[PDB]
Symmetry: D2
């Protein structure tokens, strides 16, 4: 049974970059649905599996990836953010970033274009390629999770679905991404990096 | 050279079902981009084509379907709506609807579920299947246009991208669709039906 | 605990439309592999589901749809063929075919175009739409099963993967389609058709 | 005005790894069809583009990517093979392979897994990433061309469509992969590799 994780902070702790109304809706409504629906899909999948109904299992795939992916993605998203965040990472991660994308601004520039480049709903990701031993930037459609669909290990995620910024930034997604750099929780991203870096 | 079509009405003429702020943004910002970008893609496609650059042509496909589809879809969307709309269609169309989906509410119910069922960005469509001689309901991802990707002829379209309702209805898409029935321009939908019905 | 169905006839019971060699491999080799891989996949599934591992569940989807569908499709395919097969259906099924497609001949033309239409690996199908209550034609890529992927009840499927004819009919698929019509087991298609009518 | 490339060697210049029959058909028959269909498609294109017909442009996409890509892929494929082919690359290319993949052997293992990994029709590729400035491996479904679909510069492609081995190596693709390594024209791969380095 999956659970909606409590936020690591106040809904309005990311002001003015991401406002409280968006965080509240995002967490209490959007994320909450995914969790609920994921639980309903898993329950049904177990039923199909138990009676060897392959058709059922396959039909339930779109819902499981969507809601399951939604849950995975947002749970990480909350942790990637912080009220005292911003700035740049340090240590190995920063060296990895400089090494892999050139500089820190080059990193930002690449991830920004990857996120702005999403046509429709999706996410922008900074991930770790375990087989290449280096970092990597990717974009995922809708709620397709980074690791489950690409193998990469999620480090930092940027939700570019319109519900993630329209109320505040409206159509101008670029303003949304320039704004989000001020609340990245490099402390958590580093943790995720050092985590799979071994 | 493609052009952003003037609206057939006042940005606030669809109140309270679809508010003015959404219509203004939707038309002046979202639709306007698609048009602009479509023109830029077509220009570049002509260049690729002229010099036989197949790689270029293929790479430009995502942008052409997206922006081109965006343009097609919204241009129809504006016409499907009206301040004096609502109610139900009459004549053949209504008979076609009753014949094809049962009743009018059954029609609404089916199209509503098709639109609410869109995972991520997309549209809900009532179309005409020229080869089957009957009506048909379909959903399209992102900006993929009805006719260009399915062959069906668009009659009524329901934009379910979040920018189409989030500012007003927030996460509750169902409220958005129940609301939009009050502004359907059956007069234009009928025109489109009688148009391909011959 | 899915199992390999015994072929309904001898590996060469369909000469000369489809030689015993194509049947031999296609069944003994590839169908078996699909079943084996399927059981292996479902097992990894029960495991991941019990652990609440969503990422793993999503990662197992390509293998589950591909192997469970390959098993679904081919199991149906075998029963859709027969030595005494050929000609055309009688009763209700024929009536539905004339009504829904005009004539059994235009029908074959339809399915053939759908089947010959498949770019790459895939299947052409004659399925039944529970919703609309009538026959419908569809093409499915790779091993995506008709029902789990579209909800249509399969009645008659035509495997158009190159492995289903490339030996005998080489790169000319039409030759394969033209031939296969001589084998179709209309007795089975009718049973499937009747199972979903009332 | 795309044209059919003359094969670099005789249809049987690659015996016994790939018989002259597979080459014969694959080239004379299918590559030719891709070129012909491509020219036909581009023409319908210039037409639709001149008319400003976006719907038609979008409808022509499957045929354009499929036929222009089939032409792109196979043209490259031919040059990637050679009688005197086999063994391994020297100089920079080898160095990059060891560096980026560990060892030419793990490399082959990689490409093979990618190539054997393709479920359905497709291609396994050894392409170069301009961005990151190093080698990368990728798989493409059906005829989707590597560069137009991923932006990676193709260096070495391995056709894994059943028509490329089903005659000779039957349903066991590994056998085909294992064999093809004996033919690869590392002299060409190096030229392609060098063309995009500086
Ligand atoms: Mn979100
Ligand atoms: Mn819109
Ligand atoms: Mn098969
Ligand atoms: Mn080929």
């Amino acid at each position: 049974k999956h659970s909606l994780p409590d936020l690591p902070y106040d809904y309005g702790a990311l002001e003015p970059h991401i406002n409280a109304q968006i965080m509240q809706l995002h967490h209490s409504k959007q994320h909450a649905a995914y969790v609920n629906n994921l639980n309903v899909t898993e329950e049904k999948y177990q039923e199909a599996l138990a009676k060897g109904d392959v058709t059922a299992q396959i039909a339930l795939q779109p819902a499981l990836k969507f809601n399951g992916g939604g849950h995975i993605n947002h749970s990480i998203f909350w942790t990637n953010l912080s009220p005292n965040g911003g700035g740049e990472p340090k240590g190995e991660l920063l060296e990895a970033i400089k090494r892999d994308f050139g500089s820190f601004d080059k990193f930002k520039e690449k991830l920004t274009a990857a996120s702005v480049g999403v046509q429709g709903s999706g996410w922008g990701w900074l991930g770790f390629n375990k087989e290449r031993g280096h970092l990597q930037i990717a974009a995922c459609p809708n709620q397709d999770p980074l690791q489950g669909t690409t193998g990469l290990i999620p480090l930092l995620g940027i939700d570019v679905w319109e519900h993630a910024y329209y109320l505040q930034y409206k159509n101008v997604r670029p303003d949304y991404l320039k704004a989000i750099w001020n609340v990245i929780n490099w402390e958590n991203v580093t943790e995720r990096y050092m985590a799979c870096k071994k």
